[PDB]
């Protein structure tokens, strides 16, 4: 379902602290409640030297923030991604300045806007309007229904609380 | 994908402590390793009173076994509920005599064989050649590809170590 990638994407760069900004998903579903499935907040990405993508984030499990680890596999696509697991699903990075902002989404094959989520990914807590304007247009096509965006304090929160 | 369900299931009946005395998936992935996605290990059915499935189980992650807790949703038919997550899957009792086996599967919709994997749950940590009889009839349309079976001393152990 997404169409735009970031070409000559350096994954190597991509490494360090990040704060999910925003997120948005197709369904509702996916978003609204704190235990909601893609409802996950992004503590750091970690490339691995062999290119892999190791994911740090949190997210609310049985009335609780709990840290998980995700890693993406590398594949054809410098800025396509797999994540190891049930109905596979794919990690696409849209675009990113490495230093400021990182738009990416995860869908799963075989069924985009029945599963279809992506991010804004800022390096500070603080909102970037400049990236959200990237992050919106970017979606401006895709097939959104719910949208979430935090604040400093809550960005400075274990699981945007 | 699944085409044999368990006519007049009383979900109440099939609460209590259940061993994972074997497990079957369409696709070596989903079990090979310790960390593979389909690889849980059931502790116990929690049956709820409005008729929904509380599921408890355990699960490697990360270099340790992970007690983990998940909810099936009851639907229109009796032996078929929704694990509340992407991609939706459904979880099918396929038979039971509540008091010494239960065989149910895990399918994710859109995509049988690409996703798909079923246990033969038992009571006691004692392997009963009974149950496994009826768990490979079963299996025998279904389209597996790993399968895996414990021993008493493994049952007794977290994540049949
Ligand atoms: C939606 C989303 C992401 C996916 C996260 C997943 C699939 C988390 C799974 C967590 C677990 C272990 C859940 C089971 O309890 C990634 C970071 C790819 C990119 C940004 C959007
Ligand atoms: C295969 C299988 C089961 C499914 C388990 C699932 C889907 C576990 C998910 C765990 C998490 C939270 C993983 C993310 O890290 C159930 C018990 C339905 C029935 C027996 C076969």
Redesign the pocket.
Known sequence: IVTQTMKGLDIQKVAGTWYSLAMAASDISLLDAQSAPLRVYVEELKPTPEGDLEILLQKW?NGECAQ?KIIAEKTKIPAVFKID??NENKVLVLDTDYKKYLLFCMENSAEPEQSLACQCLVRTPEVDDEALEKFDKALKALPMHIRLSFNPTQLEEQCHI
């Open positions: 499990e998980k697991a049930l």
